[PDB]
Amino acid sequence: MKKLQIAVGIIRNENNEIFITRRAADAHMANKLEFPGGKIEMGETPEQAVVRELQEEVGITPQHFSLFEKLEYEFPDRHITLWFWLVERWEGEPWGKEGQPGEWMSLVGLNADDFPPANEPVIAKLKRL
Numbered sequence: 001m002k003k004l005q006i007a008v009g010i011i012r013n014e015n016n017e018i019f020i021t022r023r024a025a026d027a028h029m030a031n032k033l034e035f036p037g038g039k040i041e042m043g044e045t046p047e048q049a050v051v052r053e054l055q056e057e058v059g060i061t062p063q064h065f066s067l068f069e070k071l072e073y074e075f076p077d078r079h080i081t082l083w084f085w086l087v088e089r090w091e092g093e094p095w096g097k098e099g100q101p102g103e104w105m106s107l108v109g110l111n112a113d114d115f116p117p118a119n120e121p122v123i124a125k126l127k128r129l
């Protein structure tokens, strides 16, 4: 079974909205809503990975961010460790830089069923803010 370290950014604006993208139909966790992010590469740290991933996926540079949650989840065919970074300050304006759908979503309106099941406790904890 594949093992992966994944860094993702919870991008929260001043209006308690989160920038959420939707995964491609032919990807793992196809069509799911997601926090932008991706695999931590060899030779880079989790903090460096979330910066690089958000630059690649949505065109922002996170700064002064914090680790909101770290958890592990066993999917049917892979084991992933997810690093959820809370990103409240950044340079740039997030957009669908890789052609993917992206939009701002109110925190209170998030439905954990729309996300990969690994995100369940994080979406709950975000609504506790």
Ligand SMILES: Nc1nc2c([nH]c(=O)n2[C@H]2C[C@H](O)[C@@H](COP(=O)(O)O)O2)c(=O)[nH]1
Pocket: 006, 008, 027, 028, 029, 033, 034, 035, 036, 037, 038, 039, 080, 082, 116, 117, 118, 119
């Ligand atoms: N990018 C991202 N990936 C997630 C989230 N939740 C989650 O289980 N994953 C999983 C889906 C993929 O198996 C893997 C990410 O790899 P890619 O983003 O490179 O597809 O992590 C999330 O919120 N954002």
Ligand SMILES: OC[C@H]1O[C@@](CO)(O[C@H]2O[C@H](CO)[C@@H](O)[C@H](O)[C@H]2O)[C@@H](O)[C@@H]1O
Pocket: 047, 063, 064, 065, 066, 067
């Ligand atoms: O791990 C994040 C954690 O560390 C602090 C300092 O105690 O922030 C530092 O690390 C962040 C991630 O690299 C940087 O963005 C930040 O600039 C740096 O001070 C905490 O703020 C944070 O909770």
Ligand SMILES: [Mn+2]
Pocket: 036, 037, 038, 039, 057
């Ligand atoms: Mn990704």
Ligand code: NA
Pocket: 037, 038, 039, 053, 056, 057
């Ligand atoms: Na990516």
